[PDB]
Amino acid sequence: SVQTVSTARGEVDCVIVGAGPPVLVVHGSPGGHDAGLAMARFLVAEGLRAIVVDRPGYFGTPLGSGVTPDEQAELYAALFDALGLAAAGVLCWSGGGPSSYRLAARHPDRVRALVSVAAVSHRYHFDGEKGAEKVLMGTGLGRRMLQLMAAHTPEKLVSATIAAEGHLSKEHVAERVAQIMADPDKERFTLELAVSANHSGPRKAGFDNDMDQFARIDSLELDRITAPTLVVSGTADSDVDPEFSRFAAAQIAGSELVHLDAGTHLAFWVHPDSGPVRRRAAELLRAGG
Ligand SMILES: [Cl-]
Ligand code: NA
């Protein structure tokens, strides 16, 4: 299902799925179209169509198609041109923030609505990984272990992921895990995103590029954004601090900020009160369609 689209800004890979008002779905760091499709499932179910990119440096999209957040925004607009598309909704999460914010800021005519989930909204510095976590997230061996865990010990993987992505107590992690193991969509989402967190191999170029670029952000100029905007933050997110979302909402006039109490970085998909937020996101992204 991956298609290469030749744009005026270079080649970009994407997966085109669903039917309805279109939404550009922008993965985090690391990520790729696997993460993006997992992010997009609720949209397809709500009767929207998703355009799920591989950002430059991930899988088949060459880094040269856009290194900076601003160049990645330029690529997305060039992708819309290559699809004959005037404008689309935008759904971003985490490291998908900067390029999505730039698209909304500098190409406002191309963005119908913005849903920004725990998104990097200003300069950000990655804390490296040490010891076992480093091997697990940084190597092909680590990648294979995550794949085996997802296939064969899914509850253990879900637990590890919820703990890594939040500041929750042991007891609250276990409560979240039991919820997820009772909802097949939540389980599937979590397992897919856990595997995509490993930045080795074909995710390495894009991941290293994102870490370098996010550390160099001057301003993304979110105050320029005029799209109707929903910003979503889990209060226990240990990956992208809630302050990034409060900042973003304060910059974007008319934006709405939704907090998910005791939510991890995955809250918008896995928090027990997230269903209404996804429904609201979908309605916003339909943008009168
Ligand atoms: Cl959560
Ligand atoms: Na934790």
Side-chain angles (χ1 to χ4, degrees):
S1 68
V2 177
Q3 303 196 45
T4 301
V5 179
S6 298
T7 85
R9 297 289 301 189
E11 287 173 10
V12 65
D13 281 6
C14 65
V15 179
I16 297 293
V17 65
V23 183
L24 173 73
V25 181
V26 188
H27 70 75
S29 304
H33 64 260
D34 56 340
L37 283 165
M39 292 168 58
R41 286 190 181 94
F42 81 100
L43 290 173
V44 170
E46 287 269 1
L48 295 90
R49 85 182 173 91
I51 299 157
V52 176
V53 284
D54 282 303
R55 294 195 290 104
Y58 294 99
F59 292 146
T61 304
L63 190 53
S65 289
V67 166
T68 69
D70 198 68
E71 293 166 342
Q72 295 187 5
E74 202 64 34
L75 183 62
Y76 306 154
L79 174 55
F80 286 2
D81 290 350
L83 304 173
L85 186 62
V90 178
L91 173 68
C92 67
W93 178 30
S94 203
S99 59
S100 299
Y101 288 126
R102 290 308 293 161
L103 182 64
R106 194 165 54 77
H107 295 266
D109 292 350
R110 311 309 290 279
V111 178
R112 296 226 177 285
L114 178 58
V115 178
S116 181
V117 184
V120 175
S121 59
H122 63 67
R123 187 171 290 196
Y124 161 92
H125 292 286
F126 171 54
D127 31 47
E129 292 138 341
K130 55 225 130 287
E133 199 202 11
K134 181 181 212 200
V135 170
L136 188 62
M137 304 289 131
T139 62
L141 167 70
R143 189 183 51 242
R144 293 180 256 123
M145 194 171 335
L146 292 165
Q147 294 168 354
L148 289 197
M149 287 179 71
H152 299 291
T153 66
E155 184 161 341
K156 284 202 201 112
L157 188 50
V158 166
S159 184
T161 303
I162 295 313
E165 295 299 302
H167 291 299
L168 300 178
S169 71
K170 209 167 295 299
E171 291 80 4
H172 289 155
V173 170
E175 185 171 292
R176 185 72 71 263
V177 169
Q179 289 161 3
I180 291 173
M181 299 315 286
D183 180 339
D185 295 331
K186 288 183 171 96
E187 179 178 349
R188 174 175 47 181
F189 176 88
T190 306
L191 297 171
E192 288 179 2
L193 270 295
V195 171
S196 77
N198 169 293
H199 46 81
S200 68
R203 302 185 217 256
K204 181 172 155 61
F207 176 71
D208 286 348
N209 181 58
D210 287 347
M211 296 300 99
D212 172 53
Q213 287 298 314
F214 300 172
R216 287 178 210 278
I217 294 165
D218 296 317
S219 181
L220 301 172
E221 310 185 303
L222 271 64
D223 54 289
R224 294 173 66 183
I225 297 173
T226 53
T229 295
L230 166 62
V231 185
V232 183
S233 175
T235 71
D237 195 327
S238 63
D239 195 324
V240 173
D241 197 82
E243 176 272 349
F244 284 97
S245 292
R246 276 194 289 278
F247 173 75
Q251 302 318 291
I252 299 171
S255 71
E256 303 181 330
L257 180 56
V258 170
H259 302 283
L260 285 165
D261 281 342
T264 67
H265 198 48
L266 284 67
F268 175 71
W269 295 268
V270 309
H271 184 282
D273 304 327
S274 61
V277 192
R278 284 194 310 281
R279 283 192 283 288
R280 167 63 181 160
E283 183 52 38
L284 196 75
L285 292 160
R286 280 192 195 100

